[PDB]
């Protein structure tokens, strides 16, 4: 199957510009009706625009006109989305897609890029502080790790280097009142395992190159 491959996550300050790419690893790019669609943080889809590389036809959602620019490099089969004066509300997962053949053709596709996460914030890179959620003192106990005050997303959490996966709940990040994210990761275990097994949350934050392995112990 012919698919689309996009460039990597973007982290930008309000006022900055952006440039993301969408390469077809298939097929013939010049005949595509390529759409850009962004998905808002818990929200719907916002349609940005369309380009046909052949013609250089472009249509823009009026709300984004003169912020957004669609272009195409016909030589490398790559579509681009440029965006100036980013605002915090431009924080979204950005998709490129090919869904529609020329109208009247009866032709439909469903090619989606893997998505490009764009974060627009004035906050600066900060590593998380990792704190224990200690099992206190019947059959089942719960414990975890509080991962606080990091920027940007994402963080990764495993338990005991991946050896522990059953009963694990890693919560979605919430943006705090500071410009900073927070999350918790929990696991339920039998209480009889507490004296017997060790529990370490492996927290990795690539953007700041912080790796923390926090041992979680009773009381």
């Amino acid at each position: 199957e012919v698919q689309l491959v996009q460039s990597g996550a973007e982290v930008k300050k309000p006022g900055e510009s952006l440039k993301i790419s969408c390469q077809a690893f298939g097929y013939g790019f010049i005949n595509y009706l390529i759409e850009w669609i962004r998905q808002m943080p818990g929200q719907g889809l916002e349609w940005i625009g369309l380009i046909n590389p052949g013609s250089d036809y472009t249509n823009y959602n009026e709300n984004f006109k003169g912020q957004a620019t669609l272009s195409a490099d016909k030589s490398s089969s790559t579509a681009y989305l440029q965006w100036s004066s980013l605002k915090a509300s431009d924080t979204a997962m950005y998709f490129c897609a090919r869904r529609f053949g020329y109208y009247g053709s009866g032709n439909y596709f469903d090619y989606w890029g893997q998505g490009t996460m764009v974060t627009v914030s004035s906050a600066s890179t900060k590593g998380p502080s990792v704190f224990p959620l200690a099992p206190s003192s019947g059959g089942t106990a719960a414990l975890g790790c509080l991962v606080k005050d990091y920027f940007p997303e994402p963080v990764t959490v495993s338990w005991n280097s991946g050896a522990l996966t059953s009963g694990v709940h890693t919560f979605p990040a919430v943006l705090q009142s500071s410009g900073l994210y927070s999350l918790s990761s929990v696991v339920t275990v039998p209480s009889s395992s507490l004296g017997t097994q060790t529990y370490i949350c492996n927290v990795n934050h690539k953007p700041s190159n912080t790796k923390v392995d926090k041992r979680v112990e009773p009381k």
Binding site: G44, L45, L146, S182, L183
Partner: protein, 218 residues
């Protein structure tokens, strides 16, 4: 812009039962060429949207027979013959008759199961965090259904407001349950001047509320 409106926004379905999702457009989606460009998508968790049905009622190749569309003009219906675990996610209608192209808000389909009370756990702040000058107190509701639960924070039996954030997992695909964290945030100063910290939990699976508490220091 053509406004697309979906009802309902949340759809609990018992596995094997039918499901209907309606979409209404602000104006007709009949194009000047005679086609009606109303399409239906499913966006499974973590994935990009995938096409189910194009131009009202045409099953896209590779899509299971149990999905079907009907409608005309401004009123459209997606039906799922017998819902299955793989059907979970957000269903969107999509119009491409008029520029700018637009989408419905999304309809979240989840698996319906019997009511299951949450297991509640309260966690005090760590001393390492107390050196920070902040206290996070965490309450966990584990493996409950339905999603809807009220978490009240009581501090020396005084009821807190605006002071905590909730976070909720996606529906657990294996047991159809949700888990929820409520994190109460206090200044080290405010934490150190009260005694009882209680997480109060109301839910359909509990006849009467469950309170889990600790006293600071003990």
């Amino acid at each position: 812009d053509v406004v697309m409106t979906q009802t309902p926004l949340s759809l609990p379905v018992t596995p094997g039962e039918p499901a209907s999702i309606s979409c209404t457009s602000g104006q007709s989606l009949v194009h000047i060429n005679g086609n009606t460009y109303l399409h239906w998508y499913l966006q499974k968790p973590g994935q990009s949207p995938k096409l189910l049905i194009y131009k009202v009622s045409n099953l896209f190749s590779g899509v299971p027979d149990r999905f079907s569309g009907s409608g005309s003009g401004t009123d459209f219906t997606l039906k799922i013959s017998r819902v299955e675990a793989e059907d979970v996610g957000v269903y969107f209608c999509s119009q491409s008759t008029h520029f700018p192209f637009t989408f419905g808000q999304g309809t979240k389909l989840e698996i319906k199961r019997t009511v299951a009370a949450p297991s509640v756990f309260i966690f005090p702040p760590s001393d390492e965090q107390l050196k920070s000058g902040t206290a996070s107190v965490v309450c966990l509701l584990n493996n409950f259904y339905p999603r809807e639960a009220k978490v009240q924070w009581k501090v020396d039996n005084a009821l807190q407001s605006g002071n905590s954030q909730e976070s909720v997992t996606e529906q657990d695909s294996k047991d159809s349950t949700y888990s929820l964290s409520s994190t109460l945030t206090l200044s080290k100063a405010d934490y150190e001047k009260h005694k009882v910290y209680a997480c109060e939990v109301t839910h359909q699976g509990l006849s009467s509320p469950v309170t889990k508490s600790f006293n600071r220091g003990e």
